[PDB]
Design a binder for these strands. Structure first.
Ligand SMILES: Nc1nc2c(ncn2[C@H]2C[C@H](O)[C@@H](COP(=O)(O)OP(=O)(O)OP(=O)(O)O)O2)c(=O)[nH]1
Ligand SMILES: [Ca+2]
Ligand SMILES: [Ca+2]
Ligand SMILES: [Ca+2]
Length: 341
DNA sequence: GTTGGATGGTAG
DNA sequence: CTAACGCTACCATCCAACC
């Protein structure tokens, strides 16, 4: 069938531009301030103006402020971005009811029965692009191909404010030419390990004997690269169900003291149980980011769903568990709920 | 020798 | 305080329980 992929352009940043258009065309940086000191924290994202000077997601707000001291630094308003996202995802639903909301900013439509060929798909893509640009002022990039992965790849090639169709014949061309690093699911750690095996594109995966591919990346990514490269890979647009909900916050200073940390842990619990919204988790994990940025987690699965009261007292037992079992001072603390009924 | 649970890594 | 927030899917690993 034919998959159409939407990825909203510089999302949090753009939304801020829609809310304050006197920002458009000059560098905008959306940050998560951590409160540890003046301008501590990270950059959630940045518009392309900012992005031209290396201000991207994940870098400290202070590294960015040295590069672009005069840029606009805006604190992250996820509540707001989520509202816009929700509305756009709802727009998308009126184009195909076979939707998979993949993330806050991306979604896959299976348009197979709304269009006859890729050319009709492209026009639909333009229809969708305008409709969003008209109803939400957000530019997005559309990637259309035979399936999820490739449609995502097309979007990655056209962004920002782009549209790429990757026809059955174009698919084949990329397998041989696309950098494996650009394959969805292939990050730096996997890229590195694949380059260690002479694997640069997809192609060289069909070259390498399966046996030593899983013997570097595990069974899953191995199957994944191959089905992609053999032009099989069908994965259907399945309606997303949220499997875990969590919240994790940053402390004013690293601490090992149970009492200093609790208020942070509870803040997260409260936030999490709120985001849960009618969902009853049977599992809770307290997650701690150490001083050296290792992420550790202690958790517990219950025979039956967890009440907020249970969450509270178990989280503490779990934080105790982390504190006794891990030497390091904790920097960030939070909780995550899974296994909903 | 699967399925579930706890914990950690990877990636987007 | 001294730079590194936030989220969630899926997978890997280990091991204990177990049909
Ligand atoms: N707090 C935080 N938010 C992030 C981070 N990475 C991404 N996000 C949020 C902000 C982004 O606007 C949003 C969508 O992620 P994308 O990967 O699609 O990047 P973005 O849309 O900003 O650029 P776009 O034109 O596709 O490239 O997700 C991160 O490291 N931290
Ligand atoms: Ca995206
Ligand atoms: Ca995006
Ligand atoms: Ca990559």
């Amino acid at each position: 069938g034919i998959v159409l992929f939407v990825d909203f352009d510089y999302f949090y940043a753009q939304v801020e531009e829609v809310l304050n258009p006197s920002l458009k065309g000059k560098p905008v940086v959306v940050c998560v301030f951590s409160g540890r000191f003046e301008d501590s924290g990270a950059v959630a994202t940045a518009n392309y103006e900012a992005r031209k000077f290396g201000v991207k997601a994940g870098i400290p707000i202070v590294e960015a402020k040295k590069i672009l001291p005069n840029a606009v630094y805006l604190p992250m308003r996820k509540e707001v971005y989520q509202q816009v996202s929700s509305r756009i995802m709802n727009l998308l639903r009126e184009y195909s009811e076979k939707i998979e909301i993949a993330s806050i900013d991306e979604a896959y439509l299976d348009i197979s029965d709304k269009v006859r060929d890729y050319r009709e798909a492209y026009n639909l893509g333009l229809e969708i692009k305008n409709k969003i640009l008209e109803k939400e002022k957000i530019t997005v990039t559309v990637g259309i191909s035979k399936n999820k992965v490739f449609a995502k790849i097309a979007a990655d090639m056209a962004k920002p404010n782009g549209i790429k169709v990757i026809d059955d014949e174009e698919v084949k061309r990329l397998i041989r030419e696309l950098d494996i690093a650009d394959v969805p699911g292939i990050g730096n750690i996997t890229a590195e390990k694949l380059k260690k095996l002479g694997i640069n594109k997809l192609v060289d995966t069909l070259s390498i004997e399966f046996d030593k591919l899983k013997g570097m990346i595990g069974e899953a990514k191995a199957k994944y690269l191959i089905s992609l490269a053999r032009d099989e890979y069908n994965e259907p647009i399945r309606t997303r169900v949220r499997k875990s909900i969590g919240r994790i916050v940053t402390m004013k200073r690293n601490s090992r003291n149970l009492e200093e940390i609790k208020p942070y842990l509870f803040r997260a619990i409260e936030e999490s149980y709120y985001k849960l919204d009618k969902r009853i988790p049977k599992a809770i994990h307290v997650v701690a980011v150490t001083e050296d940025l290792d992420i550790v987690s202690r958790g517990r699965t219950f025979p039956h769903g967890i009440s907020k009261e249970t969450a509270y007292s178990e989280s503490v037992k779990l934080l105790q568990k982390i504190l006794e079992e891990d030497e390091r001072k904790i920097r960030r603390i939070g909780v995550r709920f899974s296994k909903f009924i």
